[PDB]
Amino acid sequence: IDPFEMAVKQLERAAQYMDISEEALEWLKKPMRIVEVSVPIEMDDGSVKVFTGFRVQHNWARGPTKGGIRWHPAETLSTVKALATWMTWKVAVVDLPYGGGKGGIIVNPKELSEREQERLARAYIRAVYDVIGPWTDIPAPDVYTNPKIMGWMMDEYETIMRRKGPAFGVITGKPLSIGGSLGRGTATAQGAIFTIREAAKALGIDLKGKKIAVQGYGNAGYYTAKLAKEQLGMTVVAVSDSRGGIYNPDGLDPDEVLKWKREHGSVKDFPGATNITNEELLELEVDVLAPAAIEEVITEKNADNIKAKIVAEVANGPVTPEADDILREKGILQIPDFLCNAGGVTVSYFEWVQNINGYYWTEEEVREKLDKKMTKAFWEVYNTHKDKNIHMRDAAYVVAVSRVYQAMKDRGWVKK
């Protein structure tokens, strides 16, 4: 509807910058498989309640589809389809043998208990077994789905499969006790850190004691700031949550910021730092900028006032396309949000590899492998963005869609 057609429009805006076939563009627009299921559960009161579950596998030319599961009351098939179409290219940009998928249940998990959550997860797996699998479709954690739910669903899948294969590999984000992966907690942020270091290297600027402004202070934002300070030599000077923000040119301690927010519910009035708002945060003179909160933080109204040299879109959708154009014509190097947030997808791929191989990597090995994947993804995007003189998002889209086109042409799906 709205989101699916938005994804289709983004795909066409990418395709007009590359030599793709018309039949391939049409094939990419239509998701390969959509599964609607009536997921039944027995409520805690003894009644039976049926929810609507969606499993959309957008494409599997490059390999088994990889996609999250979302439990949000406002879910429609359009949102699932668009998101699946979108992490198709997420797994494409970072060179994974994956397709894109999305799972969803039209449900309000706020008033579902632990028993109800377990039953709903188990019943969703019972409904969507025939269309999933370790080599076919790998669900992953997403909004309102925590690794406890995935332990439950892996249990159900191994129960139904009778443990004939690598059950652990059917889904990702499982608890560390049963087929979990190290680096899953700090994954997206750490991959964003590798991309930030690579962008600084490409731009020609060194990160020793530079300035980074991080907007949004969820787990991802705190990890991004902490890892940037610890590794890159970043002197973070300002961080904001939804409620408010702080500024301190002397540098910040992300551990202290997290402690303050936990103690007081927000980062408001952190000691030693002036209280500022998010719009104050966006225009600050920093070297790196990283938005990690609600989508479309940067708008056309506040794009020409950005002074940061590098923008790392840690959060999804944070910059409007015309604001992206403004930042491009300002000499500001960006990082596409789906290219930036590819750390979680890369570590989920790593977890799947560990499950399939039966061998579990250390946090060290995971870190170096994520480093390699993230660096090659960013460098491919930047090199296409240099050769074709196109935007960051356009370059990443070109890389992803070119890979998917090559996968289909090799599979024979599209003869042209």
Ligand X SMILES: NC(=O)c1ccc[n+]([C@@H]2O[C@H](COP(=O)([O-])OP(=O)(O)OC[C@H]3O[C@@H](n4cnc5c(N)ncnc54)[C@H](OP(=O)(O)O)[C@@H]3O)[C@@H](O)[C@H]2O)c1
Which residues of the chain form contacts with ligand X (CB under 6 A)? Answer: 68, 140-142, 146-147, 173, 188, 219, 344-345, 348
Q: Is 382 annotated as a binding residue?
A: no
Q: Please check whether residue 4 is in contact with residue 28, taking contact to mean a CB–CB distance below 8 angstroms.
A: no
| Shortest Å distance, C-beta 316 to ligand X | 8
| Shortest Å distance, C-beta 203 to ligand X | 27
| Shortest Å distance, C-beta 140 to ligand X | 4
* Residue closer to ligand X, measured from CB, 215 or 248: 215
Q: Is 244 annotated as a binding residue?
A: no
Helix (H/G/I), strand (E/B), else coil: 404: helix
Q: Is 98 annotated as a binding residue?
A: no
Q: Is 387 left (phi over 0), alpha (psi -120 to 50) or beta?
A: alpha
| Shortest Å distance, C-beta 106 to ligand X | 19
| Residue 131, both tokens | 């269309």
* Residue closer to ligand X, measured from CB, 10 or 188: 188
Give dist(CA 351, CA 89) in Å, integer: 19
**Would you give the DSSP letter of residue 267?**
-
For the question of residue 102 being annotated catalytic, the response is yes
* Residue closer to ligand X, measured from CB, 172 or 235: 172
Q: Please check whether residue 266 is in contact with residue 244, taking contact to mean a CB–CB distance below 8 angstroms.
A: yes
* Residue closer to ligand X, measured from CB, 60 or 247: 60
Measure CA 201 to chain center.
23
Give dist(CA 318, CA 168) in Å, integer: 34
| Shortest Å distance, C-beta 415 to ligand X | 32
Q: Is 217 annotated as a binding residue?
A: yes
Residue at 393: amino acid letter: R
| Shortest Å distance, C-beta 135 to ligand X | 18
Q: Please check whether residue 276 is in contact with residue 246, taking contact to mean a CB–CB distance below 8 angstroms.
A: yes
* Residue closer to ligand X, measured from CB, 146 or 231: 146
Give dist(CA 213, CA 318) in Å, integer: 14
Q: Please check whether residue 40 is in contact with residue 48, taking contact to mean a CB–CB distance below 8 angstroms.
A: yes
Out of 102, 261, 309, 373, pick the active-site residue.
102
* Residue closer to ligand X, measured from CB, 247 or 397: 397
Handedness of CA 94, 97, 138, 83 (dihedral sign): positive
Q: Is 216 annotated as a binding residue?
A: yes
Give dist(CA 15, CA 397) in Å, integer: 8
Give how far Cα 212 sits from Cα of 21, 57, 207, 220, 225, Å: 42, 37, 10, 15, 8
Task: List, as one string, the DSSP characters of 192-236.
Answer: HHHHHHHHHHHHT---TT--EEEE--SHHHHHHHHHIIIII----
Q: Which residues are annotated as a binding site for NAD(+)?
A: 216-222
Active site residues: 102
